[PDB]
């Protein structure tokens, strides 16, 4: 009956959206074990958080003993890759091969991390994936996770279309999303100086690049800048200005990452369960 720092296991972490959201909420993070294989994503999470994250490489090398020693965990979050479950891929391999089957590596480790019987300590978890997926794969994921997802579209709090399914047991996952006035809801709010927006909401941004020239500067079509993309996804400006990354790598990282106001919405009820400031 006492507040202690939160202990997080983040699978397929990426640019550490979870740690950034938890810290912005003022929650003391005692342990943030992140499993990630992308090198520049680890560089981002290392520099932008000064090595508070414990990186543990591939998720299929995480053993049961790994969970028990690294644990106990309070919050287990994860987001399996999307390019093999989405309709944006003609070569989509479904949920059972390609990079889609990595979802089960979450389900596996999730049962490894759940508290033992006779132990009802607080334990929360969340799994995210794209809404654009074959309904058989959606209900299969619901079957393995033993729950149905809530659907949150970042358009309600961000400046882009980002509809995603969220399975989990976080407190108040069904409550209606209400954007704060710091949230930049329309594209004009995220542009640098002397740039006018064509749309008020930009279509969904994937890992790759009409609606691909959504900015007019000095009367000509121009693409979005990396800093503008960071503001669209809600990340701090220059969150990805790490390790000589250019337009190509940064848009990839921000394209397969979470929208931070959505994660702030989902994680905000967790302040009332762990140590705060």
């Amino acid at each position: 009956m006492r507040r202690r720092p939160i202990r997080v296991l983040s699978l397929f972490d990426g640019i550490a959206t979870g740690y950034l959201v938890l810290k912005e909420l003022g929650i003391k993070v005692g342990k943030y074990v992140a499993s990630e294989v992308c090198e520049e994503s680890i560089a981002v999470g290392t520099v932008k958080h000064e090595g508070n994250i414990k990186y543990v490489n591939d998720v299929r090398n995480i053993t049961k003993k790994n969970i028990e020693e690294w644990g106990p965990f309070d919050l287990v979050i994860g987001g399996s890759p999307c390019n093999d479950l989405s309709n944006v891929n003609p070569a989509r391999k479904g949920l059972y091969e390609g990079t889609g089957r990595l979802f089960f590596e979450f389900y596996h480790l999730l049962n490894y991390s759940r508290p033992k019987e006779g132990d009802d300590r607080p334990f929360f978890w969340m799994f995210e994936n794209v809404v654009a997926m074959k309904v058989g794969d959606k209900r299969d994921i619901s079957r393995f996770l033993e729950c149905n997802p809530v659907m949150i579209d970042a358009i309600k709090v961000s400046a882009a279309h980002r509809a995603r399914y969220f399975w989990g047991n976080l407190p108040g996952m069904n409550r209606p999303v209400i954007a704060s006035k710091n949230d930049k809801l329309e594209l004009q709010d995220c542009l640098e100086y002397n740039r006018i927006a064509k749309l008020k909401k930009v279509q969904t941004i994937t890992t790759k690049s009409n609606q691909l020239f959504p900015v007019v500067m000095n009367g000509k079509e121009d693409v979005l800048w990396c800093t503008e993309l960071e503001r669209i996804f809600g990340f701090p400006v220059h969150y990805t200005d790490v390790s000589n990354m250019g337009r190509g790598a940064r848009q990839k990282l921000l394209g397969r990452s979470w929208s931070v106001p959505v994660i702030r919405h989902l994680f905000a009820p967790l302040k009332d369960y762990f140590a705060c400031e």
Partner: protein, 191 residues
Amino acid sequence: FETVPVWRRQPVRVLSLFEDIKKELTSLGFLESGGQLKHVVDVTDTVRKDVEEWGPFDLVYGATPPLGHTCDRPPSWYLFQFHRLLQYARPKPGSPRPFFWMFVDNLVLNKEDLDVASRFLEMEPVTIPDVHGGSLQNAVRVWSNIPAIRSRHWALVSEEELSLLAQNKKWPTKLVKNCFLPLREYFKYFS
């Protein structure tokens, strides 16, 4: 699980997945002619409450389609579904009791599927070959906690030999039927 005296061994309650082994279990004296076996082939819409409503199980057997049978699913589907329903079926840790399970592959699982299956079932598979005239005709891999199942392994069979057999080609229940014999020390014999 320490052995059970003969007067008190109850009839075994088995769950068969993706394949049926009713006849093989009757031939060994585990089932009586007339029902203790629940067999489902499509477990896509199986929830934990369904595995619970079905009487408490003592054995959960899953197996892939045979080697030659052109497959409906991807091979990892059977492994993942077997793992999920096995989690649904095992006893809650508050009441220990004899519980066993077995998943058999007939050289249908791909090389990555083998690693993911061994990691999910926390055991390296056991190679059960059929060998005549010095040549390997057919084989199965098994993952199980059945007591004497690891000593049934054949180290003579390499992975390349198995994959060549797979490329060269009914479910050979002959290879797995003997693996249940150590279970008669825990359940009823019907003669």
